[PDB]
Design a protein around this ligand. Structure first.
Ligand SMILES: CC(C)(COP(=O)(O)OP(=O)(O)OC[C@H]1O[C@@H](n2cnc3c(N)ncnc32)[C@H](O)[C@@H]1OP(=O)(O)O)[C@@H](O)C(=O)NCCC(=O)NCCS
Ligand SMILES: CC(C)(COP(=O)(O)OP(=O)(O)OC[C@H]1O[C@@H](n2cnc3c(N)ncnc32)[C@H](O)[C@@H]1OP(=O)(O)O)[C@@H](O)C(=O)NCCC(=O)NCCS
Ligand SMILES: CC(C)(COP(=O)(O)OP(=O)(O)OC[C@H]1O[C@@H](n2cnc3c(N)ncnc32)[C@H](O)[C@@H]1OP(=O)(O)O)[C@@H](O)C(=O)NCCC(=O)NCCS
Lengths: 729, 392, 402
């Protein structure tokens, strides 16, 4: 009943009250403790006072305007508080969101028009405050965003976002368009789908246009002033209620289509959002709002939400704030970029560098190959033209920055080189030797290598301080991680120039010390090897792929083991064997290596050769190889599905811990974001390092449960699942 | 304790879904028509001894809501003490009504019971009642809801039944159903439906296509791949059965059960109830069972409960919901093909959900007498119900 | 042949209709919460021995359609072999599920069965399923359809029950229901309802008004006079009962059963099943019966059924320690009491639907479990449970304490 959190016997105020001569109150949120407005304890108390004041002075108030004095409108909930909520804190979490929504419900059912002056980002709880208003005006300014992205943090819009968007758009539209993926819209796109009603040019017009709308609303629509569409007697939900015959025909397919999209991964937030939407549409608004609170409390107290909030909020902000970037270096603008090689890697690097706005010189051995590399950018732009993403004038200038060539002298005037040729140390010495003198004197020499150490590659260039590893991931236009490997002679200046370049092209950088395999290629190898080992042990190939998809990977391992060439996995096996045999030691061959040679002997070495674990016709993948079952005697081993899933996740998690012990990774924030954005580690785990401290199973929770489960795997599948001593005590 | 006997087992013809003859007939009228036929066959039957009327109904809404069994008692003018209860166990509701009636007679607390089912799928479509297994996302997501049709395509994929194998059984059902009608096997049990004027509305199972050919069944397109794709139930089924790569969609509108309207009635009573009213027992309920399979056990359970084996059964009757389910049932228990659905099934004549159980039961009561055989076993399909009857 | 025993009998608290606590809870969740309670009471229970789950539901539509019993089996994680069937015999569906389960156990073809019912009347109002007896004019005209409400007022008119008499029984039910709660009688049977977080939603019967006075009941308006005029059911009733000139509408919202949400579950099995699973039998099902009376009056059904179950067990009124009749309407209980001369100290000793509520499909199993606990608390022997039914039906059950 109370608009406040406590009712027994002191935070700071964040809202500024202002009533004009007409009777229009202007609530301006301006939290003095930070740079953004956030649903912390100070907001709940400040909004509690203002709402109590709007009720006590309702005889002298005609309208309300909610605005902000920050650059952003309202940044959403307090992640630093929700991540600490234990399961025993479910009662406090429930009462908090119930108190937050009680204030908005009073603001909504005030009998007076309420307008939101959105002067910038209205994300999460911020949009929920705007959705409680009767009219929304957004300033079409650069950088403004609107949406409900709490599903990306393992949460749901618990401040009425689910209840109101379903009331505005219906179950199907609100879930697909806004809720399920938590997409963030620009003000132009926001007005199109219905989240915003009107747009203005600048932010100085917001409050005047808000009071102008209140004045017109009271004179034109005096009866329906301050009444939402669902607070009217003749309200009909768009698309119908779950009891409607039309919606009830397709409603059973909603949870199944969700399992199809999630591939059976243990991500509870989309399930809770879909349940709260449908259950809420069967009851009144207030009862629906309370159901929304109960599903919100189950997610916040859960572990998956804490894993996502750790990775996609704290760990991601620490990276975007120069956490791995050096401290003393300044900035060095880039004039012209030079990409060596026109393969899928080289062509992808040229597209993302030209999409950012840099001049690119794409060099290969022949002009025919360099033009086919630029054609990769043309077919991406031609697909973006017919879809309506980019314009014709902007796409012509993008391709105009890509200059295909075969002559080495066309690299004259290049201050940033990104080599992307074949994996061979002697070749990279030869390719860098031809151009190290033609390029600018203070030019970055990047190498997109997978396993070869950067220290060894730097011996082929004169200035090794500017030589660095810039590892991209195919397809480059989609994968947002750039693994920055730091060699032994690599300086700190070149480390920052690539760091700022990665941010300039719109990607997330991590800093890794030089080692054979780095962090991505080394850890992703343990994941594909466990699957190939399972195939050799006799596990059904369909079960292996299901185990990979249900684990949360974007691609099943055998399907991934074809995109990655089996000839490359054979070369890495010889490199690791050479490094141990020639040093006076006995090599321990992984059981997956035998499966690699068997497929090469049969002539099925991946999609590149046109045949691998899958069958390929006309480039399109279709069906597993029927001879795969007879080759490895599939069916003779039927382990539990969770044992297959855990074998893939633990192999990466244990190997990620080794990279932290050996100093290959400096922080766990890079380990999580690197595993998620680089090698596709399931986002529900929060990263391959968070998977250890946030493990959850039938045995227990935490690092202790991870160790006990690792020992259970090691006792039945091999000592490689034994936990390192750094996890023990 | 007491033995339960079957004294009458009649049914209406099954009218098709599209442009059906029984679409103008309310489902309540389908039951009253059968009640009046029992009165015509036994004019001096003291209906005060009838203690309950149990009707199965899978979609008890609209014309089928509000306890249609009680509506049948009052509309037909039966004694107000005759009770009337509706139950729903999906496709097995018809046989569960007879099984429950038989169990109520064994207890001694009931003497003479009417049992059966009613389903007017053209007037009240399947799914009209809603539910939680489909319209509650939290439950649907957890239980991994999959329609029976996808499960039938999955069974044919696991057991290795081809498109021509299920179409071969579809042709088998259409032939044996047409031969049964031409031979007059159903003449005394199928009660023609009439209006309030006595005019004929339907007197045959108009869903039958007796001129079905093997080439015609091959021209039909898979009917359960537009739901498996737009609904994504194929991916859901394979998430549990992870060792299967692709589901072979082999079931069409020619090898699956048909959407029809119909009703059935069985009069179960004790030995003393029949001797008091001068009724001749036609069969005897030997044993009943209830079980389930992976998301045949009910058949094995009723066999062990009656102390019998597969060889001891003269006639097997399994509802032809889908061709793959029958071929699986035949392969698991090694059923002789000349004993399985000898007079056709739902593929040819239709599958009225709430009434099918009591329809295929009364079919075996007649076929046991026509062949002068002894025992018959009726079963229906992740639940399962089985019943064993013996000729008297 | 076999003997049926009651091993457990639990129920949820009954949440009222307007601003009810259970309005947000789906009726499927109510049943699962009771299934989970049975698991907590018997964690080593081999659920494979459970062969069927029989639930009563009067309005099986929407949240209650699609065989809610089978949905409770799959949603709670029970074996797929555990059956799951919904039935509907109007008000006595909950008791019919118990009686059917007992008869399936006696037949020897079932060993351990769960029985009960569920009705979320605030989410699924009565009449949502439709029906020919009301919506089809041909049969409505012939069967002379009259709601139970008018038939109750007709009972008081014929039997001579005044407005003060029905309100006197309403006061008695409120007092006895309050004493039972304050006395801790419902401590072990009523299973509180909680959400997915464990937070409390409801732990008591909301519909109760323990501070009820005779003066407050007298100020209530006759609730069933709007159906008598706009519907014309008064004239329809007096066409069958032509010796009555006028119907005295004495029933209000204070002397009629309440519209609530709730569910109940009863575990019934054989002696061998209880011995295998280490269960202690609480009561034995002695006999069951079914009958009824005239459809227009609709509520005089339980009297022929109560007599039928007494003759089947060789018992009389003097042999029964407790009588439990559903308080659908006050005049029905007062007529049942006068016809069989039931001592007032034996009839509905712990309250009834007037005070606590009438969740249609579950009320039969709720009052059945209420007598199992009171026989055990008083150390008595027999109790007779009966419910009036729509259409003029009746179901009775005699239990014996073990
Ligand atoms: C019947 C069902 C398969 C869908 O059938 P449908 O496709 O709507 O039925 P139709 O009769 O239109 O059959 C489709 C076509 O095949 C043809 N066809 C059907 N059987 C045929 C046969 N034996 N020979 C030749 N053609 C045949 C039809 O004439 C029709 O041709 P058309 O499309 O050109 O008109 C489906 O509704 C069903 O009943 N599935 C099972 C439901 C069930 O078990 N529910 C569970 C309850 S718990
Ligand atoms: C239940 C029943 C229908 C299952 O049919 P089935 O053909 O026996 O099925 P299976 O269990 O053999 O499984 C089928 C296939 O799936 C395979 N399979 C199952 N799980 C698997 C897994 N996780 N990984 C790989 N393969 C798997 C099996 O190995 C088998 O392969 P195969 O046919 O090539 O040997 C049947 O066995 C039956 O009716 N049994 C009676 C049950 C009973 O006794 N009930 C008690 C009544 S009182
Ligand atoms: C429940 C039923 C009586 C309708 O009740 P209603 O008219 O909605 O009335 P309520 O229960 O909401 O109570 C209305 C008033 O009575 C008052 N009231 C009820 N009991 C009271 C008591 N003991 N003391 C004082 N006041 C009381 C309430 O406070 C309320 O006052 P208000 O109107 O000022 O708010 C009627 O629908 C019914 O009995 N249905 C059940 C049918 C049945 O038994 N079986 C059907 C099988 S098919």
């Amino acid at each position: 009943s109370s608009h406040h959190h406590h009712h027994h016997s002191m935070p700071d105020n964040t809202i500024q009250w202002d009533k004009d001569a007409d009777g229009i109150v202007t609530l301006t949120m301006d939290d003095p403790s930070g740079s953004t407005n956030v649903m912390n304890e100070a907001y709940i108390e400040s909004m509690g006072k203002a709402v109590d004041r709007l009720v006590a002075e309702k005889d002298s108030i005609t309208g309300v305007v909610v605005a902000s004095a920050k650059k952003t409108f309202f940044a959403g909930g307090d992640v630093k508080t929700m991540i600490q909520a234990r399961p025993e804190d479910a009662g406090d979490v429930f009462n908090t969101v119930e108190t937050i929504k009680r204030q908005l419900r009073t603001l909504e059912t005030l009998g007076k028009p309420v307008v939101a002056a959105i002067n910038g980002a209205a994300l999460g709880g911020g949009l929920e405050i705007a959705l409680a208003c009767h009219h929304r005006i957004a300033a079409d300014v650069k950088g403004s965003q609107l949406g409900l992205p709490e599903v990306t943090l393992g949460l749901l819009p618990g401040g009425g976002g689910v209840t109101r968007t379903v009331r505005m758009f219906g179950i199907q539209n609100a879930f697909v368009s806004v809720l399920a993926q938590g997409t963030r819209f620009k003000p132009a796109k926001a007005k199109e789908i219905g989240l915003v009603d009107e747009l203005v040019a600048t932010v100085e017009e917001l409050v005047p246009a808000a009071k102008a709308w209140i004045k017109e609303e009271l004179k034109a629509n005096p009866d329906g002033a301050g009444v939402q569409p669902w607070d009217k007697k003749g309200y009909k939900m768009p698309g119908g209620t779950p009891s409607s015959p039309g919606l009830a025909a397709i409603l059973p397919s909603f949870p199944s289509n969700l399992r199809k999209q999630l591939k059976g991964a243990p991500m509870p937030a989309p399930r809770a959002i879909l349940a709260a939407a449908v259950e809420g549409a069967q009851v009144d608004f207030d009862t629906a709002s309370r159901i929304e609170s109960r599903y919100f409390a189950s997610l916040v107290t859960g572990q998956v939400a804490k894993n996502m909030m750790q990775a996609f909020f704290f760990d991601l902000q620490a990276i975007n704030a120069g956490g791995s970037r050096p401290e003393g270096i300044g900035k060095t603008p880039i004039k012209r970029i030079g990409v060596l090689g026109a393969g899928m890697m080289g062509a992808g690097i040229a597209y993302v560098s030209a999409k950012a706005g840099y001049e690119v010189v794409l060099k290969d051995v022949s002009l025919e190959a360099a033009a086919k590399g630029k054609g990769y950018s043309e077919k991406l732009e031609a697909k973006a033209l017919e879809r309506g993403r980019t314009t014709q004038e902007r796409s012509d200038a993008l391709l105009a920055r890509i200059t295909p060539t075969a002559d080495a002298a066309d690299f004259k005037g290049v201050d940033f080189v990104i080599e992307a040729v074949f994996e061979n140390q002697e070749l990279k010495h030869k390719v860098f030797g031809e151009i190290e003198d033609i390029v600018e004197p203070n030019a970055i020499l990047g190498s997109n290598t997978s396993t070869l150490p950067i220290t060894g590659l730097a011996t082929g260039v004169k200035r090794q301080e500017d030589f660095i590893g810039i590892h991209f991931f195919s397809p480059v236009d989609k994968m947002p991680l750039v693994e920055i490997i730091k060699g032994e002679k690599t300086s700190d200046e070149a480390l920052a120039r690539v760091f700022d370049y990665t941010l300039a092209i719109g990607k997330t950088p991590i800093v890794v010390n030089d080692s054979r395999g780095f962090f991505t290629s080394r850890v992703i190898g343990t994941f594909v090897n466990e699957a190939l080992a399972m195939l050799g042990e006799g596990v059904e190939p369909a079960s292996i792929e299901q185990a990979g998809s249900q684990a949360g990977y974007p691609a099943p391992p055998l399907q991934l083991s074809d995109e990655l060439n089996l000839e490359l996995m054979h070369k890495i096996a010889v490199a690791t064997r050479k490094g141990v045999e020639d040093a006076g030691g006995t090599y321990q061959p992984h059981p997956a290596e035998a499966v690699v040679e068997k497929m090469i002997e049969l002539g099925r070495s991946g999609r590149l050769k046109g045949a691998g674990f899958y069958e390929y016709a006309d480039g399109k993948r279709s069906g597993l190889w029927p001879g795969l079952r007879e080759t490895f005697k599939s069916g003779s081993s039927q382990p539990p599905l969770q044992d297959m899933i855990d074998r893939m996740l633990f192999a990466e998690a244990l190997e990620t811990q080794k990279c932290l012990d050996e100093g290959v990774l400096t922080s766990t924030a890079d380990a999580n974001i690197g595993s998620i954005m680089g090698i596709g580690f399931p986002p529900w785990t929060g990263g391959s390092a968070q998977f250890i401290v946030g493990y959850s199973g039938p045995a227990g929770t935490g690092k202790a449960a991870f160790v006990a489960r690792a020992r259970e795997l090691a006792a039945a599948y091999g000592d490689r699942f034994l936990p390192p001593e750094s996890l023990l005590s | 304790s007491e033995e339960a006997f079957i004294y009458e087992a009649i049914r209406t013809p099954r009218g098709k879904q599209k442009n059906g003859s029984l679409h103008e007939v309310k489902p309540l009228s389908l039951v009253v028509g059968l009640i009046d036929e029992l009165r015509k066959r036994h004019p001096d039957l003291d209906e005060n001894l009838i203690s309950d009327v149990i009707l199965g109904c899978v979609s008890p809404v609209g014309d089928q809501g509000g306890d249609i069994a009680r509506a049948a008692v009052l509309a037909s003018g039966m004694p107000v003490t005759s009770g009337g209860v509706q139950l729903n166990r999906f496709c097995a509701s018809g046989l569960e009504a007879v099984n429950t009636a038989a169990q109520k007679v064994r207890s001694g607390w009931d003497d003479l019971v009417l049992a059966g089912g009613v389903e007017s799928m053209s007037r009240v479509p399947m799914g009209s009642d809603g539910g939680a297994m489909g319209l509650d996302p939290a439950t649907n997501y957890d239980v991994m809801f999959v329609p029976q049709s996808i499960g039938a395509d999955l069974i044919a994929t696991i057991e290795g039944f081809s498109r021509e194998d299920v179409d071969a059984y579809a042709l088998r059902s259409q032939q044996k159903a047409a031969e049964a009608w031409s031979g007059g096997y159903f003449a005394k049990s199928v009660v023609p439906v009439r209006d309030q004027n006595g005019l004929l509305i339907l007197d045959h199972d108009e869903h039958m296509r007796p001129d079905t050919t093997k080439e015609g069944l091959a021209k039909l397109k898979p009917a359960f791949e537009g739901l498996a794709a737009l609904g994504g139930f194929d991916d859901v089924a394979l998430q549990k059965y992870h060792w299967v790569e692709k589901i072979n969609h082999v079931h069409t509108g020619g090898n699956s059960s048909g959407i029809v309207d119909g009703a059935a009635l069985v009069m179960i009573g004790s030995a003393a109830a029949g001797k008091l009213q001068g009724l001749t027992p036609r069969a005897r309920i030997v044993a009943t069972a209830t079980s389930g399979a992976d998301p045949t056990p009910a058949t094995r359970k009723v066999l062990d409960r009656a102390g019998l084996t597969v060889d001891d059964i003269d006639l097997f009757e399994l509802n032809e919901a889908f061709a793959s389910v029958v071929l699986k049932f035949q392969k698991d228990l090694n059923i002789p093909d000349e004993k399985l659905n000898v007079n056709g099934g739902a593929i040819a004549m239709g599958h009225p959900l709430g009434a099918t159980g009591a329809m295929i039961l009364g079919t075996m009561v007649d076929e046991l007498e026509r062949r002068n055989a002894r025992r018959a076993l009726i079963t229906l399909c992740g639940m399962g119900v089985a019943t064993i009857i013996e000729r008297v």
